[PDB]
Amino acid sequence: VNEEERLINDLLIVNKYNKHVRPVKHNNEVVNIALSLTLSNLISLKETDETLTSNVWMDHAWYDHRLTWNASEYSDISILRLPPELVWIPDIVLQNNNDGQYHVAYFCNVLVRPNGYVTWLPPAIFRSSCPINVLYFPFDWQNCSLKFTALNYDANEITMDLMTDTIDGKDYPIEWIIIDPEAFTENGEWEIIHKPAKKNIYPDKFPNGTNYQDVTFYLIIRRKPLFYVINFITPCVLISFLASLAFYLPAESGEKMSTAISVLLAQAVFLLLTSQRLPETALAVPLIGKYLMFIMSLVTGVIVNCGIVLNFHFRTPSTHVLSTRVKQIFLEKLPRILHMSGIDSTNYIVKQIKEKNAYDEEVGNWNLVGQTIDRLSMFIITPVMVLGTIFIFVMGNFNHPPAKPFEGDPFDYSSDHPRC
């Protein structure tokens, strides 16, 4: 018959294998668990909930001296398969997760070698909580970490470790989220860059506690802003540049205010669009948000200036008098500095004609004042708008994650170059 049943009965039943007892000869010693993470695919990073949903295969390995046998004795059985419900497993738990999952999703069989070496690769869907650095949205990169801990045993009983591959000759620790180049599908609007892994110890706490050791797998994910550049960015900057042209419209055609105010309405619509796409954090205003505020205040200033120009255009001698200094400075400096381009009835009618002509000439002077202040405001505002938007978006575009995943560590965690 099958020898596996006899081997299982010998290992688990005859030998009184206690599932709840740590697999160690003496209570004083420690059990080393080497674990690794394999990112099957990055499902999503919902910034409105600050939730990173990912699918990861978690690889644990340890030594259970009770699960050992003489291979030659039991018909040369090399590998053995056992459900987790029958053997001791280390409950490595994702401590930081907004959803209360805390565990792998499958609990697949463990593989046991005759020398006691046990490996286990359960898959899991993890919804971890990582804060969103929204400073340079949408040209931003996020730093989301998965923190695994051993909350059932303290560091004096089990010590979590990074798995160490055996490269030609020596063994090198695996300090990265191993990702299959062939069977990995790149996520939309997110690309992984550094993906380091590190085991951390906190000396301020004591070994006889569950807070002493952690294993953290970090993900530095850069957002692809193509969707935002196509939909939110380009139309908004185009509408802004359109508002910048309200000065070129003559005051005679009564749409000077209408275009600017309708551009303001369009920017309000864009503000409504962009509000629904970010978390309500207050670390800093997002790049899109602060650019939107800048351009909205600039459009409001353009509206105020257009109102002032219109007020100056309809000044009349019956209501206002142009002072000598005002018309002097305007009509002398600004066009040059801006390179602009019976018989009693007859007597009465001629007098009225002359008075109307003088009134018309003063109205024309007011119109010229309006035109020249309009051109001055255009030359002051349009360069400001263009330079401001270019500076904002260039500063956003130049935002890249640092070449090294950690601050002072020069190692540049990567599967290409292992250490030790």
């Binding site: 499902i43 018909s75 499958y106 697949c108 599908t185 042209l245 419209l249 003559p250 551009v263 001629v350």
Partner: protein, 380 residues
């Protein structure tokens, strides 16, 4: 039945569901895996997750579950709970937000020769890439990859039931069309262990999107806006409604951009075709408004300050109308007014001529842009 009660008592008396159902550990248990797609629940292009209602079909042989039918009153087949026997660890390698393996644990049929046939239902949220380039006239090739998680070749063998997944009971999706569906089996070897093949089966479906919804909800209003933005040029500049018309078309297009961002998938892998067309419409409206501002400023040119260039007068007033077919103290003060009015009228005539030229060119460019963006993929 008493016979079936006795039979089931005898079968599972010394049965160990942990042990693989093979007489010798060197041999492998051969499992035939088939899939039937009951319904395609949904496709999520943002997360690239396809939710499908499927039913697996595992057929294998357990030599420990063999009995003589004549010894139990002619019993040929019985139904056992799945948890009471050994089960293969089929796992959807493309899983995303869904259950990796079979979770419902439906009962299974058991012949008197050990031939177990198990047909459990499942909901697969497979993670297949979405090539959103010809959206909504796109075709998604989407796969689901099954295989044994813990065991491998020479321990368990996975073979397809047929070259094609079963689509007999497939409820029509209404939003996608199954162009072609196949299933392949792959052996993969590793240099670390070159005599232990790893077996898997990938079932792939070609889904052609029905574009009527996205057409009627996105493209048609975009067509209306792109047709109307080129219509402001037939409007005379004397009416003060030219800029109001242009900017109101712009505002309507902005609100419809809100609509499309509500509708279309928010993905950054590539620019969707309707996204490209919407950007084209935005550029068209912006250019139309800028040109309208230029035309209005030309119309309101004061001859007292501006002397019309000789080349402008010559080229426009001479060439262009000949190519068209439907367009043409008190005394001294009055003469000056008449001369200024005549020069301003010449300015207005130039504005009208350039307005008609721009109307014609913008109608032509609207036709070309509408044709160019869509006709590339519409040729099928």
């Amino acid at each position: 039945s008493e016979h079936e009660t006795r039979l089931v008592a005898n079968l599972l008396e010394n049965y160990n569901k942990v042990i693989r159902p093979v007489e010798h550990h060197t041999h492998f248990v051969d499992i035939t895996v088939g899939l039937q797609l009951i319904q395609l629940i949904s496709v999520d292009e943002v997360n690239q997750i396809v939710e499908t209602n499927v039913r697996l079909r595992q057929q294998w042989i357990d030599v420990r579950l063999r009995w003589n039918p004549a010894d139990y009153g002619g019993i040929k087949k019985i139904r056992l709970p799945s948890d009471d026997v050994w089960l293969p660890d089929l796992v959807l390698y493309n899983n995303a937000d869904g259950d990796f393996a079979i979770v419902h644990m439906t009962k299974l049929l058991l012949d008197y020769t050990g031939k177990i046939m198990w047909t459990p239902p499942a909901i697969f949220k497979s993670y297949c890439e979405i090539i959103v380039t010809h959206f909504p006239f796109d075709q998604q090739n989407c796969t689901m990859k099954l295989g044994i998680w813990t065991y491998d070749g020479t321990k368990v063998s996975i073979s397809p039931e047929s070259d094609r997944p079963d689509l007999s009971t497939f409820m029509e999706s209404g939003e996608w069309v199954m162009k072609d569906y196949r299933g392949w089996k792959h052996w993969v070897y590793y240099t670390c262990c070159p005599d232990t093949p790893y077996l898997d089966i990938t079932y792939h479906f070609i889904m052609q999107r029905i574009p009527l919804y996205f057409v009627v909800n996105v493209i048609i209003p975009c067509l209306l806006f792109s047709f109307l933005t080129g219509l402001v040029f037939y409007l005379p500049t004397d009416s003060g409604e030219k800029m109001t018309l242009s900017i109101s078309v712009l505002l309507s297009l902005t609100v419809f951009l809100l609509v499309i961002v509500e509708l279309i998938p928010s993905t950054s892998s590539a620019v969707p075709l309707i996204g490209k067309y919407m950007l084209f419409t935005m550029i068209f409206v912006i250019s139309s408004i800028i040109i309208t501002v230029v035309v209005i400023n030309t119309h309101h040119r004061s001859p007292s300050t501006h002397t019309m260039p000789q080349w402008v007068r010559k080229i426009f007033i001479d060439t262009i109308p000949n190519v068209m077919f439907f367009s043409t103290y008190i005394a001294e003060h009055m003469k000056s007014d008449e001369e200024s009015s005549n020069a301003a009228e010449e300015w207005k005539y130039v504005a009208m001529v350039i307005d008609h030229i721009l109307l014609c060119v913008f109608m032509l460019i609207c036709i070309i842009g509408t044709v160019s963006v869509f006709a590339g993929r519409l040729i099928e």
